[PDB]
Design a binder for this molecule. Structure first.
Ligand SMILES: Nc1ncnc2c1ncn2[C@@H]1O[C@H](COP(=O)(O)OP(=O)(O)CP(=O)(O)O)[C@@H](O)[C@H]1O
Ligand SMILES: Nc1ncnc2c1ncn2[C@@H]1O[C@H](COP(=O)(O)OP(=O)(O)CP(=O)(O)O)[C@@H](O)[C@H]1O
Ligand SMILES: [Mg+2]
Ligand SMILES: [Mg+2]
Lengths: 171, 171
């Protein structure tokens, strides 16, 4: 059932790195299957985040399995599938990876100052620092041993970010 | 938790009526969320479909509930959610409705003569007649009693269907 002929790409990196804004554009450009993973949490998770609370790792178990399932579905009918999922921790990455030998990660890498500048430029959006500091703390950048991780420089205008993304895709 | 100010539109209709192509531009242009519902089929379904066996109405139970779920999730954080899914039988429509008072359908409506010339329009595609008859055989036209169903006439070129879809959306 796994078409090793088709591929699935997971845009990752903290909140503010560019996942959504670049992924939209790439799928539109290569004309491909794109799925935002924020969309697959179980009804239980939506209420907990709505009740103002942070999901914990157990809550992410069923979500990432759903996403992994969704990875499975996209690559039956598309050669290029993009899924947005910040996936900061190396164990989430293994939850996605399992049974998907054809899934790989594209990591939109930047440092703090760059990503901070990016979110405060959100018109009307009040920017809270602790949130981004938790994102860096949680982030367990994939090492060299994570060999299905490709990497991208977000320090570049979106469109450059876009183009690089396409390259590492067509590379 | 149901944000009655954000809405989900399901692009329904037969296979061939433009569900995915129309929904991608409406998502692009409206800058809104788009989930294609093929991708939420349980690992079981991917295999039943792969082995070649059709799905019955039992195997869609779990899939449409996942989608209903997904609908819930998209409208927490977006005012306009579009979900592609054929939605042929009234029952499938009822199942997506459940829990989601803030959901609606946009019926990419056409007749047989039209959808067929279209599916045949792509090169290298070997078009099977029964496959679309069945489609129409299966179809349970949203009747006038289903008042969250809007309809868009497809006997119109791609762009007016995009434009009309957008109208029913902003209407
Ligand atoms: N290369 C770039 N240059 C300038 N702005 C960029 C950029 N890439 C993304 N942006 C903008 O930066 C902000 C981050 O957006 P984006 O929604 O894509 O990130 P994200 O999806 O990773 C955060 P979230 O997880 O909350 O969705 C947005 O304001 C976006 O328009
Ligand atoms: N209004 C229109 N004018 C011309 N071509 C159109 C059209 N709407 C759709 N198409 C084309 O018609 C065919 C059907 O595409 P599309 O993927 O949207 O159908 P669909 O989503 O209903 C297929 P399926 O349901 O099997 O997933 C494709 O060739 C698409 O490019
Ligand atoms: Mg995002
Ligand atoms: Mg389609």
């Amino acid at each position: 059932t796994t078409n090793h002929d088709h591929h699935i790409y997971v845009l990752m990196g903290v909140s503010g790195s560019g996942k959504s804004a670049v992924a939209s554009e790439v799928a539109h450009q290569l004309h491909a299957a794109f799925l935002d993973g924020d969309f697959l949490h179980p009804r239980r998770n939506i209420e907990k985040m709505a009740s103002g609370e942070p999901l914990n790792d157990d809550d992410r178990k069923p979500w990432l399995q759903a996403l992994n399932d969704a990875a499975f579905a996209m690559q039956r009918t598309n050669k290029v599938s993009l899924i947005v999922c910040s996936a900061l921790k190396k164990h989430y990455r293994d939850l996605l990876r399992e049974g998907n030998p054809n899934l790989s990660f594209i990591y939109l890498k930047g440092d703090f100052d760059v990503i901070e500048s990016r979110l405060k430029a959100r018109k009307g959006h009040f920017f809270k620092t602790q949130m981004l500091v938790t994102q860096f703390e949680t982030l367990q950048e994939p090492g060299a041993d994570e060999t299905d991780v490709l990497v991208v420089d977000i320090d570049q205008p979106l469109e450059g970010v876009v183009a690089s993304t396409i390259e590492v895709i067509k590379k």
